[PDB]
Amino acid sequence: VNPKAYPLADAHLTKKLLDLVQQSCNYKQLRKGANEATKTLNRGISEFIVMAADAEPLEIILHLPLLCEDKNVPYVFVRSKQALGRACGVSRPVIACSVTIKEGSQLKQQIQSIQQSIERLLV
Amino acid sequence: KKRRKERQKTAGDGWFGMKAPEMTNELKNDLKALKMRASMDPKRFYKKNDRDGFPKYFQIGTIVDNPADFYHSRIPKKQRKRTIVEELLADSEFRRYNRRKYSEIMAEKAANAA
Amino acid sequence: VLLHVLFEHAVGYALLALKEVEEISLLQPQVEESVLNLGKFHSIVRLVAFCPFASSQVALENANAVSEGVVHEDLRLLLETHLPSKVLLGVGDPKIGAAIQEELGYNCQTGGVIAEILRGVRLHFHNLVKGLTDLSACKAQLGLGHSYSRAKVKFNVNRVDNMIIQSISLLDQLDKDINTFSMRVREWYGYHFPELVKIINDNATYCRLAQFIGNRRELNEDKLEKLEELTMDGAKAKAILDASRSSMGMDISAIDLINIESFSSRVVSLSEYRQSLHTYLRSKMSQVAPSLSALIGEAVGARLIAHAGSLTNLAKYPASTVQILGAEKALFRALKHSTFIGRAAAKNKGRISRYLANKCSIASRIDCFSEVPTSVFGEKLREQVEERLSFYETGE
Amino acid sequence: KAGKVPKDRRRPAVIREPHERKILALLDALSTVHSQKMKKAKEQRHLHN
Amino acid sequence: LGKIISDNLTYCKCLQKVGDRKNYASAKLSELLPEEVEAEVKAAAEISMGTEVSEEDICNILHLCTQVIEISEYRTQLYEYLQNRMMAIAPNVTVM
Amino acid sequence: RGNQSGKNVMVEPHRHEGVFICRGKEDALVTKNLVPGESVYGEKRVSISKIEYRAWNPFRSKLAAAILGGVDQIHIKPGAKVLYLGAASGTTVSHVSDIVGPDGLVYAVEFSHRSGRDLINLAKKRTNIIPVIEDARHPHKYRMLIAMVDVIFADVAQPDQTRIVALNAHTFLRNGGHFVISIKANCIDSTASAEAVFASEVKKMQQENMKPQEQLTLEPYERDHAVVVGVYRPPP
């Protein structure tokens, strides 16, 4: 494991993460791609960021943790871009995705639970 | 007395020594325009002015260009002017609205007086 | 309440003795002046020993030791020498207190009046150690704060983009100054030989020929053969002599010829430095951003970083905004500047520019966040641009 | 005293270019509109009170 | 160094003479600077806050500051040229 | 629209020292640029005739939100020493360095090594910023680098904000000094209501021998956020 991909989720947390990513897609609440994930951070509408640790150059997504630390947005890494591709409903690999803030959403309880699970990884 | 007079020329150390500019008819015209910004646009509304008079210490400048805002926020160099008043003299939208309002006021002024 | 306190500073270790203090009422409005007022503080606190750090490296070693809570050799040297051997020692850290108590038999305390005395020492420290150290206390803290932070993050001084930003601004300044001076050189010699400005179309070529002939009075026989060698064609060299024989310009004095010669040599040497600065920028871009320089060139790559303001700022931008950074000067639109094999039609000029901008965004991130910069990725991205160019040009 | 001045004492008025008159006319029209709007807001402030 | 030395030409000559801080101790600056100022300059070299520069960086600084001393040298010659021409064309005006 | 590049504009001092107002078709809050010609995070700057000012974004800074929100005092003035907890990359730190000026000093504490590298680069250009890459929960680990300060600014966003601020205040904050604390209600306790969190945080400050004096919300720019300003060990 590259030491720069520090918050690496375990098998249990990954399953919860990919479940919520699929649900967020059905609620029209998911932005897919590194460039689109960057824009949600600039606009302050991001709940959390999920990235793929198996990008062959890992540096192409390392700008996202810098942006999150300024906006105070949690972020994690998963082991597969192909698995992250299916969870986003895309027929291609995805190395970064963003869950968007939506007022009155029914996913607020699940998003809040996942956010606290992320923050415990950072002690 | 020289101590009291020398201090009053400058805003002080609290604002890094901003100086009071010499007041001219071109500077006074700009400050009067800024005070009456509420009536420039019928669809824009503003808060009340901070002070009835003009500020004692102030400076005049222009907004520097940024490469990232080439299309988002930048005025072409032909549209740029030297003073705030000349900017108001150039734009068509303000001139069209202002003359319509000014005509209506003088219409009722003649209508009332007669 | 006679006790000793250990105070750690960026300049060195300080050992102090406390005579007496009103412990129970210390945090009360009238009694608190015992530590707040310098005159009252001197009456109850004395400096018994002081050991400054010899160098910045020595200070950094002691700073790391204090943070970890271990006793450095320099600290133990001070404590063993100047403490009698039933002793109370006040320390700011409980962990360093236990370590000292293991190394030496002193009793270490962190609670009680000790914490309030240490605020008095920290407030009045510059007065107590005044003149004992050559390096000032305020400058020492600024210096150690940087060196401590560099060690934690493993900062690399080589991969810094300050100079490339300075070089780009200075290169544009040099171009304006060289162009302005060459026009004035051309005008001064235009007074003497106004025919010459018409024949020669290059500023650099003109200064060479102006250097070659000081006066039009002496340009003949063996000189024209030399003139034939400087000029691209022999026909023009013959015409220059005929122009020199019958010219509308005035004659120049001896002192006027010295002035124009020294001014011309100044412009030439100024151009030589502008070439060396371009070479220095090329080497700097190789160390900092080899992949970005390989993709688009050192000249365009350095200008992209200058527009963003930093290399990290370039990497943080999305791909769409990177294209806008080159919009004014047409860095992506004007392709020969960056040179690529093959050409793009006017129809696909917009598509190629957008595709090239996306690759440059990726290359900037690779250079910025790699442990060791390498230009292999830049060459791979360049190969993809050539493939996309040939895709449009041939149709497959 | 303002109405009647001796011929020797009185001074000629200012002389201004067409560009100068356009700026001065624009400020007068804007000042008239601003006074009308500010005065109008007084009664609306008053009537609700 | 910048705070101690105010003369710009003297500043650039000292930089051309000595590259890094380490060479200030051995090198002598008596011809450029007075001896008491030289002592202050030498003393400040040991207690310094600055970062260490590369070999290519120090070469670039020397070339730029070399261009400075050449411009100042030509500017003096141009001023002497102007004094020659004014005294020749309008000698009475220059006296006044 | 907005403040387009190439527009004439007037700059006047604010009620707070070191702060300026940029008067035009739109009003912006600006600070005097300590390093002319450079933008830290893409903000628009204004040139004055040798003098340059930088616009301050209230969406990306919490101190600017409080100033625009009508806070009484900020206590950050020219020539003051400020301890900053939670510097992150330094967008707010850069504006704080402008306010204190060349005579003032800023101590920027940031534990993250990723943001720490940006803080060092910012400290290269601004000589009044001292970067400190350490955890703010243990002020004794960097007591060598910090002298007595006048103001403590904390934007740490932790459940234990009050304990962290109190520990730093006892160690480095002078008598009569002040603190400015930003409170995000969701961070201390998501279960509790936002208003009940604010009353609890004030209570904890009083139990640490700190006297809060004012508070306000940052409602136009933030939701369920508050800023509290107070004094530490007031003189009689």
CATH number at A88 reads 3.30.1330.30
What is the extent of the structural domain holding A5? 1-123
**A90 touches A83 (CB < 8 A):** no
Estimate to the nearest angstrom the gap between the alpha carbon of F110 and the chain centroid: 14
Beta bridge partners of F130: F107
CB contacts, 8 Å: C312 with chain A: 66
Beta bridge partners of D35: none
- The CA distance from A61 to F114, in Å, is 13
| DSSP assigned state of B20 | P
Beta bridge partners of F140: none
Experimental method: cryo-EM
- In the structure encoding, which two tokens stand for residue C394, read together? 């041939």
**Chosen from C328, C329, C332 to mutate, greatest number of chain B CBs within 10 A:** C328
**Chosen from F114, F187, F223 to mutate, greatest number of chain A CBs within 10 A:** F114
- The CA distance from C271 to C260, in Å, is 17
Nearest CB to F89 within list A44, A70, A112: A70
First to last CA, chain B: 59
Query: Cβ–Cβ of D37/B32 closer than 8 Å?
Result: no
- The CA distance from C208 to C201, in Å, is 12
Burial C176-207, CB ≥16 within 10 A → b, else e: eebeebbeebbeebeebbebbeeebeebeebb
First to last CA, chain D: 45
Query: Cβ–Cβ of B70/C328 closer than 8 Å?
Result: yes
**C65 touches C38 (CB < 8 A):** no
Nearest CB to B39 within list D22, D27, D30: D30
Report the half-sphere exposure of F103 (CA within 13 A, side-chain side): 9
- The CA distance from F136 to F155, in Å, is 11
Nearest-Cα residue of chain B relative to residue C307: B67
CB contacts, 8 Å: B71 with chain F: none
- In the structure encoding, which two tokens stand for residue C229, read together? 């060698």
Instruction: Give the resolution in Å.
Output: 2.7
Q: Is C286 exposed, middle or buried (0-12, 13-18, 19+ CB in 10 A)?
A: middle
Q: F163 vs A66, F156, F201, F208, CA distance in Å?
A: 27, 11, 10, 8
Estimate to the nearest angstrom the gap between the alpha carbon of C263 and the chain centroid: 33
**C242 touches C264 (CB < 8 A):** no
**F227 touches F216 (CB < 8 A):** yes
**F16 touches F53 (CB < 8 A):** no
Q: C132 vs C52, C53, C127, C137, CA distance in Å?
A: 8, 11, 10, 10
E28 min Cα distance to partner chain C (Å): 23
Q: Is the alpha carbon torsion for C218, C224, C225, C230 positive or negative?
A: positive
Q: D41: which residues sit within 8 A by CB, 6+ positions away?
A: none
- The CA distance from A38 to A54, in Å, is 19
Backbone angles phi, psi at F184, to 5 degrees: -105, 115
- The CA distance from C374 to C287, in Å, is 9
- In the structure encoding, which two tokens stand for residue E76, read together? 């003096």
Tokens 């900037």 belong to residue: C364
Helix, strand, coil percentages for chain E (3-state, nearest 5) = 70, 0, 30
What is the secondary structure of C219-267 as a DSSP string?
Answer: --THHHHHHHHHSSSHHHHHHHHHHHHS-SSPP--HHHHHHHHHHHHHH
- In the structure encoding, which two tokens stand for residue F98, read together? 């402008």
Query: How long is chain C?
Result: 396
- In the structure encoding, which two tokens stand for residue F80, read together? 């003051």
Is F161 flagged in the annotation as binding? no
| DSSP assigned state of F65 | H
CB contacts, 8 Å: E71 with chain C: 266
**Chosen from B26, B82, B85 to mutate, greatest number of chain D CBs within 10 A:** B85
Tokens 């001393």 belong to residue: E69
Q: E36: which residues sit within 8 A by CB, 6+ positions away?
A: none
- In the structure encoding, which two tokens stand for residue D40, read together? 């109008």
CB contacts, 8 Å: C150 with chain F: 120
Residues 28-67 of B with CB under 8 A from D: 29, 32-33, 36, 38-40
- The CA distance from E25 to E42, in Å, is 6
**C141 touches F147 (CB < 8 A):** yes
Nearest CB to E56 within list C134, C142, C283: C283
Q: F173: which residues sit within 8 A by CB, 6+ positions away?
A: F83, F148, F149, F150, F152, F179, F232
**Rg of chain D taking only CA atoms, in angstroms:** 19
- The CA distance from C167 to A71, in Å, is 33
For chain C, say whether A60 makes contact (Cβ under 8 Å).
yes
Angle at F170 (CA atoms; ends F166, F175), nearest 5 degrees? 115
**C42 touches C18 (CB < 8 A):** no
The SS3 call for residue C29 is coil
- The CA distance from C282 to C275, in Å, is 11
A98 min Cα distance to partner chain C (Å): 15
Angle between helices F113-125 and C137-153 (to 10 degrees): 140
Q: Is C11 exposed, middle or buried (0-12, 13-18, 19+ CB in 10 A)?
A: buried
Query: Going by DSSP bridges, is the β-strand pair F8-13/F19-23 parallel, antiparallel, or unpaired?
Result: antiparallel
User: Which chains neighbour D (Cβ–Cβ under 8 Å, 3 or more pairs)?
Assistant: B
Tokens 């004095």 belong to residue: C253
Q: Which of A94, A99, A96, A119 is nearest to A45 (CA)?
A: A99
Beta bridge partners of B60: F10
**How many structural domains is chain A composed of?**
1
What is the secondary structure of A50-110 as a DSSP string?
Answer: EEETT-SSGGGGTHHHHHHHHHT--EEEES-HHHHHHHTT-SS--SEEEEEP-TT-TTHHH
CB contacts, 8 Å: F78 with chain B: 13-14, 16
Tokens 């005739």 belong to residue: F49
**F107 touches F68 (CB < 8 A):** no
Tokens 């629209």 belong to residue: F1
- The CA distance from A105 to A111, in Å, is 10
Pairs across B and F, CB distance < 8 A: 105
**A97 touches A35 (CB < 8 A):** no
**Chosen from C273, C275, C283 to mutate, greatest number of chain E CBs within 10 A:** C273
Q: Which of F189, F236, F194 is nearest to F215 (CA)?
A: F194
C301 min Cα distance to partner chain E (Å): 20
E54 torsion bin: left (phi>0), alpha (psi -120 to 50), beta (else):
beta
Residues 311-340 of C with CB under 8 A from B: 317, 321, 324-325, 327-328
Is F111 flagged in the annotation as binding? yes
Q: Is the alpha carbon torsion for F82, F87, F89, F95 positive or negative?
A: negative
CB contacts, 8 Å: C324 with chain B: 67-68, 70-71
Q: Is C278 exposed, middle or buried (0-12, 13-18, 19+ CB in 10 A)?
A: middle
- The CA distance from C77 to C69, in Å, is 16
**B83 touches D16 (CB < 8 A):** no
Q: C255 vs C208, C261, E28, E85, F190, CA distance in Å?
A: 20, 10, 39, 10, 87
Instruction: Indicate the residue type of C94.
Output: P
**A27 touches A102 (CB < 8 A):** yes
**C210 touches C268 (CB < 8 A):** no
Query: Cβ–Cβ of C307/B67 closer than 8 Å?
Result: yes
**C101 touches C94 (CB < 8 A):** no
Q: How many CB atoms lie within 10 A of CB F213?
A: 12
Query: Cβ–Cβ of B71/C324 closer than 8 Å?
Result: yes
Q: How many CB atoms lie within 10 A of CB C292?
A: 34
Q: C135: which residues sit within 8 A by CB, 6+ positions away?
A: C11, C143, E47
Q: What is the side-by-side order of every strand in the sheet holding F129-132?
A: F129-132, F105-109, F81-85, F149-154, F173-184, F225-232, F210-217
Query: Cβ–Cβ of A63/C318 closer than 8 Å?
Result: no
